[model samples]
Target chain A: KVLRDNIQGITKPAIRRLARRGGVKRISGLIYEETRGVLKVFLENVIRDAVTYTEHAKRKTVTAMDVVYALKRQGRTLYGFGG
Target chain B: KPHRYRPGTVALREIRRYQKSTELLIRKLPFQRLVREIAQDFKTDLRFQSAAIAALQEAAEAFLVALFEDTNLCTIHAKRVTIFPKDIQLARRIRGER
Candidate 1:
C-alpha cells in the first residue's frame, strides 16, 4: 500500500488507450508490441537515471530531459548506446 | 485529496498493463550471454532513436505515477509544489478541498 496509487499505476492503460486513440487495433500487434516495449523500457530507464526521482518523497517534476536520459541509458542495454 | 491523483479502477488496470509490458520486454529480449557477447558492440542509430522515444515516454508516465500512485511524494504542477501527505485524514481533507 505504501507504493501504490491509482493514477500512476494506471499509466499503461491510459497510454494503451491513448495509442488506440491513435488507431492501434489490438495491443498484441507489431505496432502495439513495439509501442508497449518502447514505453516500458523508456519509463524504466527514466526511473533508473533520475536520482531525484528515486529519493524519498521527492517532487515529481519530470521534464523532457528525464526522458532523454532514459533513452540514452536504453542505448547502453539494447545496442550499446550505439547512437 | 484530488480525484485524479487517486487510483481509480481504470488507472489500476492500466498500471497492471504498463507493468506487464515492462516485464514482458525484458523477458522477450534475448538473455543468452553468449548471444549478447557475439552480437558485438555495434551501434544502430535507428535503434538509438527508438530507445530515446521510449525513455521519454517513461519519464512522462512516471510523473503521472507519482501523481496517482505515490501519496507521500510531493509534486510540482505548473509552478506550485504540492506535498502529498500519507495520513488518510489529511489526504481526505486534501481531496475534499480539491
Candidate 2:
C-alpha cells in the first residue's frame, strides 16, 4: 500500500505535466483525481507481487527492473503476455 | 428535428487518438530533456512516461464522465486552453475542415 501510494502521489503531478506538454486544452483538476485512482489500481496490482525487497549486497536495492517485473506480472493480460 | 444523439462516440474516438499520440509525444518529450536533467542533477532515470500517460488518459476519461456526458481528450488539460484555438485549428485545417 505504501509503495502504491507513493506511485499515486507522484504520478498525478507527472500526468499533469505530460498533459500540459501534449497541448491538452482544458486541464481539469478532476483529471488529477481520476489519474490518481487509475494509477492506484495499476500500482496496487504491481505491488501485489512486489513483496520481496532486493538484497543489498548480492542484489542491491529494488531497481527499476524489479518494478518492471511487478508491473509485468500485474498487467500480464493487458500486455498480451502469459504470466 | 435535431441531429441524432451519439453516445459520446465522436469524443471518445478523439480522446483515444489523442491519448495514443500523446503517448508517442511523451516518450520523445523527455529523452533529450531527461538527458540534460540527469546530466545536471544526477537524478534517477525513472522514465516517468508510463505512469504519466496512463494518468493523463484516465483523467481525460474522468473529465468526460463528468462534463458534457461525452468523452473528450482536450478536456483533460483545458486549464491551458489556448492550445485548442491555435493547435486544434491547425489540425482541423489539415483535415480540410473549416
Using TM-score as the measure, the top candidate is 2
Query: Tens digits of per-residue lDDT for model 2 on B1-98?
Result: 88854455476666665666554422334333432333233224333335433433333333323222222232345243433233333443453212
Error of 1 at B35 (Å): 32
Off by over 4 Å in 1: A1-8, A11-16, A27-41, A52-67, A75-83, B1-98
| Clash numbers, per candidate | 13, 8
lDDT of 1: 0.37
Q: Least accurate stretch of 10 residues (summed lDDT) in model 1 chain A?
A: A22-31
Give the DockQ (C-alpha) for candidate 2.
0.05
Every model's DockQ: 0.05, 0.05
Question: For residues B1-98, could you state the per-residue lDDT of candidate 1 as single tens digits?
Answer: 75655475567767775685574222223222211222233211112233434444443444333223322222224553323223322533453222
All candidates: TM-score: 0.23, 0.30
lDDT of each: 0.37, 0.40
lDDT of 2 by residue, A42-75 (tens): 4444433332423322442334444454545542
